[PDB]
Symmetry: C5
Subunit: 338 residues, 5 copies
Amino acid sequence: APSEFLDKLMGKVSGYDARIRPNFKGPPVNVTCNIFINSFGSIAETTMDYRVNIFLRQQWNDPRLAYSEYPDDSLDLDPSMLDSIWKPDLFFANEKGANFHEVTTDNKLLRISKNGNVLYSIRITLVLACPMDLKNFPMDVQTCIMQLESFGYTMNDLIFEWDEKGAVQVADGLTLPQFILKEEKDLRYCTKHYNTGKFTCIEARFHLERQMGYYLIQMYIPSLLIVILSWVSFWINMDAAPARVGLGITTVLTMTTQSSGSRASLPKVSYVKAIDIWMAVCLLFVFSALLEYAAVNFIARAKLFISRAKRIDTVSRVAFPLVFLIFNIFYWITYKLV
Amino acid sequence: APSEFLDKLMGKVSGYDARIRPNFKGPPVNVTCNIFINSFGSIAETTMDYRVNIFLRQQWNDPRLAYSEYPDDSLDLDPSMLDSIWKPDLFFANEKGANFHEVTTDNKLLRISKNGNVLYSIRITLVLACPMDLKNFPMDVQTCIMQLESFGYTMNDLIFEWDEKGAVQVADGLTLPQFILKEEKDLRYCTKHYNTGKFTCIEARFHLERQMGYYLIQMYIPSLLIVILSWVSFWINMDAAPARVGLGITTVLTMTTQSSGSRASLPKVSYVKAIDIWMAVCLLFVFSALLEYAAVNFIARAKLFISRAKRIDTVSRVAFPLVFLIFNIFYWITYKLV
Amino acid sequence: APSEFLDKLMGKVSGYDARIRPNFKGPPVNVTCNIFINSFGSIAETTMDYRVNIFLRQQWNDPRLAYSEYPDDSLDLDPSMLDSIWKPDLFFANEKGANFHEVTTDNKLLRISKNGNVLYSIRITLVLACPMDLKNFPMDVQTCIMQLESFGYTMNDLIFEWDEKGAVQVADGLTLPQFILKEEKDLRYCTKHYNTGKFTCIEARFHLERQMGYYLIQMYIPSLLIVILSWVSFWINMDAAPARVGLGITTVLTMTTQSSGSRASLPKVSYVKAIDIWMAVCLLFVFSALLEYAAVNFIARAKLFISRAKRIDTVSRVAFPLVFLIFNIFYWITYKLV
Amino acid sequence: APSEFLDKLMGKVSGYDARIRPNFKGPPVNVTCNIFINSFGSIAETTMDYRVNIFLRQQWNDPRLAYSEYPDDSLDLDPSMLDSIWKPDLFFANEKGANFHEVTTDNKLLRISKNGNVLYSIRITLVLACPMDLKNFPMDVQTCIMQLESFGYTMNDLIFEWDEKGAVQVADGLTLPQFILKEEKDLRYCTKHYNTGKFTCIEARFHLERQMGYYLIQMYIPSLLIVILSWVSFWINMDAAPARVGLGITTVLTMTTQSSGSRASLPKVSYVKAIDIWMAVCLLFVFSALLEYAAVNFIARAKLFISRAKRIDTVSRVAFPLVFLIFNIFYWITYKLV
Amino acid sequence: APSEFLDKLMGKVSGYDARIRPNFKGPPVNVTCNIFINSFGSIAETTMDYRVNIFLRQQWNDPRLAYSEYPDDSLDLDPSMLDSIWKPDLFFANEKGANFHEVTTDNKLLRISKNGNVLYSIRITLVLACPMDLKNFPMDVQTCIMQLESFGYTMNDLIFEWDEKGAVQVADGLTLPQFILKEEKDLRYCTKHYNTGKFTCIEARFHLERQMGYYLIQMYIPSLLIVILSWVSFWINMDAAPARVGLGITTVLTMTTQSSGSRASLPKVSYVKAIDIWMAVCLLFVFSALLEYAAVNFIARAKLFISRAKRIDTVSRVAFPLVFLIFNIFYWITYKLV
């Protein structure tokens, strides 16, 4: 009996097509779809993309699927039946490759309302390439977007609508290495004009704040502390060049190495990164320290002159912490504030 | 005759559906499933995930498969027959991609009890992304988890139960590079509430203890031994700066290099790692040694003063081993104990 | 009724073949096809190739598909129907591997004009290996090409024609890391003569200008600035060798390291790269500075001679900025101009 | 006529099942199988696995395939027919992924003896993860194993037997980078006890001897030669510290770098590697040389004392070559002998 | 009518088998096949293999395909028909994995002569692992080979013959990074004796000459030029150790780094590479320079002795360029000549 029902409802009998859209030659079918995301992973500045795998729940109405036969409000047909009925046909626009998970059974869910409302849920893995502005690299917030468009049909045939409530959902414990997602989520429409026609699209907004911790501990503190090691050279014995020259040249080389170190992770980019100016000024300070030693020697190796060097030492040792401090204070305001 | 039997049992004759659940419109089918793991491999902090391939043995009852025909308690149908009968439909939730092994024949096992109890065994390879707390990196125990959920049906339709005895099994000789599994294994339930309904899930616990050997030989001993090389500088000739300055600056640079070396392996993380404080204090000690030399020179280059330097040398050479030792002793207690 | 129509139009009834070309035994079918590109990504000098994913819209006429039945000018059959009708058969010649996107539905579009004009649109991802002349590496414009050829049929059977208007289209916001596409786009024919016959092909031209920003900030400025640090050595104390020798040897080593750094990114190439001469001359200048110090010492260590060294110092300090400047000016003209 | 024969032999007519084992309800079918290996490649300590692709020839008897019809002793059916007949179902146990080669035709061979003996040959590519004891890394012999088990049926149903003669065969010119296979090959049985039942398995042994050449030229000779460069410091001028200190510190740093270099290739391992002790003792010798210089200075900077330093120099220069030599001789015995 | 013809020719009607070889129970079918190569790419010493994608044109005769029906000499059936007819079954022996290109249509060509001569053309991508003798690495010519064998049938069933004219063809503009193909191409037979029987095979020869340019600019010139920088140390001030010791030790370290640099690219190999002796002798020369300085000091630090050092300086400065030159001249003869 139930076999005879699944057979009477869909398939060959009753003359039901997979190929023909629901409500053929009528107002455009609505696909009301929400996405529930499992994770973000391997977000890479280098590859310029992230991966995400999602449950996609898309709902539409079809008249000819409606039954009066069972009392139950919704029936769950086998995931295999899912191939039989017409499906709303969408791709992710920016996908750069994606796949179904076929492990064990196919991951699919199909439940038909007695009304004829159809719920269709599929688990997909996506790569997505998002352009991301690195204009300020360490402190940035990046906006990551996906847009669902119908490649099958035009605007007058098919329409996508986010769900009025709970259109995008996150896993309960979901956390990102390097990143934090913002609870505030933006959702907005788009319409694609292509040479073929105009196609519907809907796009989510994700707002990601990078974790400042790693780059603070790794990149910044050694720079700060090496500059700290640079100032003590001004304190040292006015007579002895080698100690201060060693400290200074070793610190400027170490700073050069520290600078080159950051280059490897980020993708190759035309515009100047935010960390770059920090390294330029740190390198500028240590190089200026070296220049200071060499200049004092240029004055000394030329009895009054060495006295003049004696004052330039003090005024320098007073000037550098103020210079680095005013720079520091002028610096943090831009990136960590406003 | 046996052909006619496999044909009379399942398939078109007798009106048997693959699509309809066993015991349709009744208490939720029980899937009693144990997993037998072959290996863990390529556990990577970087990629944040591991791979594991498992034999999954899942057992359920279906009434309409029950035969009286053969005397034998269990019959093994061809692995091809397996597509014909209804299967319990599960995915791994956190999978991040997985596959069947189709090499030679399909790897599948299907045996039907005369009772109608069905055993179904499939060999699967899984990637699994587990969040792992690195809060103490070198000494950590990490808990690695997989959770099986039914994407097909709701709670009232289907249920997963671990086997009362021997629910998770390990290969006889199984060993992990960098790791040791703990014989004590935890198993606990979960129920997923999704917008669609509530779905059953069961999850295993794995407790992994990292091998301290590698990081002890590689990371720690050179630090210890370089500090040992740092103390001998206090012994050396009070008159000669270059030897001690060479030893000290070379050791602080070498320590900086040793520090940067560990950074490359671990994933980029906001919170401070356990090895990090060790490197910070080692670097702090060698930098303090350099500061010591420079300070003695600052006192000397300014006949009583050099005598004062003569006492600060001794009190330092007595202080450093005690400082590093009290640090060491205070250090190990946290990570290697309690 | 509409089912009966899709069935009367194509398929078994009416005796319609997929296998037989349209207009069999007649003038060669025209495939008028435009491509709409979504992105370029991971353009790598190392792998020598780029990836691009495109919508390919190809249009041809078939007589036996023409209907009088519906009033509408174009009908959109199901993407599944697409397998049924004859398709124009093309590969990308230089592809090096490619794939369809099968995520969710197949990405396909098939619309049949009442005339019988057929529009067929498929979303494809391509790898493409383009030979690229690096003869001048940092400043180059590279021309990137794809060529569509028919592997199925000969010249007399099938022909490809770019669309008279809008044959290649770009995404509205499309931008390349390291690169800028030029709005001016060239399109030209080709005919392949193979042992089998002559096959049609059409090829696009892409003109890419590399972004000078990254290589300017990374490669050039440290060279310039290290040479700047090299000239100050001539200013320094005539009596003291160690400071100038340290500055000079450290700068020549640093320049050697900076030179080796660029080697890793580019593919291994026989002919000399444009950056190579810059590094050769920079290394030549710093090495000549070192040679200068050593030569002054060779004259001095041999009272008049040291006076001669005193003049060679000044004439050198005047000569180097002019030498590097005339080199610089002679250099930029070639690459950044004409 | 021959068509009618292939059809009368197998398939629908005569009532022949693919699903039912040969000799159903009888003694366990014998699969006598030999493997012919094409190559080993990318053997990686890091990934812990190797790849190998093999021709697998497995032979079994089936009664109902036996014909009297043709005179020829063996008939070769089309590789497509191969799906039709029952196949012995095996996986590789430790596979970690594998695949068929489907390029051009399927690679398969099926020949049926007039007796009914069936030869079935398939070309497979395997990854295989073998645990390998690195306890002595450079000089080790590693034993690499594969084990074929039947996942389909139990012990009483199916059995695997190596061929009495020529069970494993090697390609005529087969050579391994880094490795040499040993002509002596061990073959032994196994039986797997799983919760399901007991399954047959057969396993090959491979004995691989690593090539000492690479690690001798790369790792060892620079250590030996740097120690050689260390001894000459004892010869040098008793009065001049900088030359010997430069030689010594540069050599100990270079040895540290050489040591760190080897770490990158091998997988991360708890137990101490054989090369590790060599590097520890080399580093110990050069560090002891540095300690020697510093100690002589500690005695000298304190007229009799410098004479005592004068004797400790000679006795040292006599002691080091004997110490390194007795170490060397005691060292090689373990790894390169017995 | 043409439908009825494609149907009357092949398929069910007329009793035509795919499974049965052409000319069953007769002289072995000839497969006359030529290959047209598109490119070589990613030739890697590390992975030990290259990739190549080819058009494979294979031709054979079948009697039962011959028609009298159409006047045209050759008919092109749909690429789909290609599955229907019997195909000659070959693999590449050393393939290590390969694939068809299925993008858009299948890439296949099937044309049937009125004679019954069949042309069958498929576009394939191959990985191929070739053993390559690196005995002289920088200057080597490597011979790269592929061999086509029939896995399906024995020698008496099937035979492969290269085409009497134009058996291997190259793309018009085909060029290799690092390499140049030689226009002279060798083609020779092989017969494989396996335990199963004897199988036909045919193999191409490729002769590749590596481009000396890259390794000349990168590896050799810095060695030459650093030795040039080594000789000037003999010119310098007899009195001053630090300058010459700095030049010498820095150059020997730089040479050690330059040496280690080349190691990373090539696969790990037992036998000594050609570049290795060059680096050994360069390192030997710079180390001998350092030894020279130290020896002159050992003679001097011991008034006549310093005069003897004064002559050894001159005779050395005369000896080194002659030694390096006679080495150079003796060196190039082997690799770049004969």
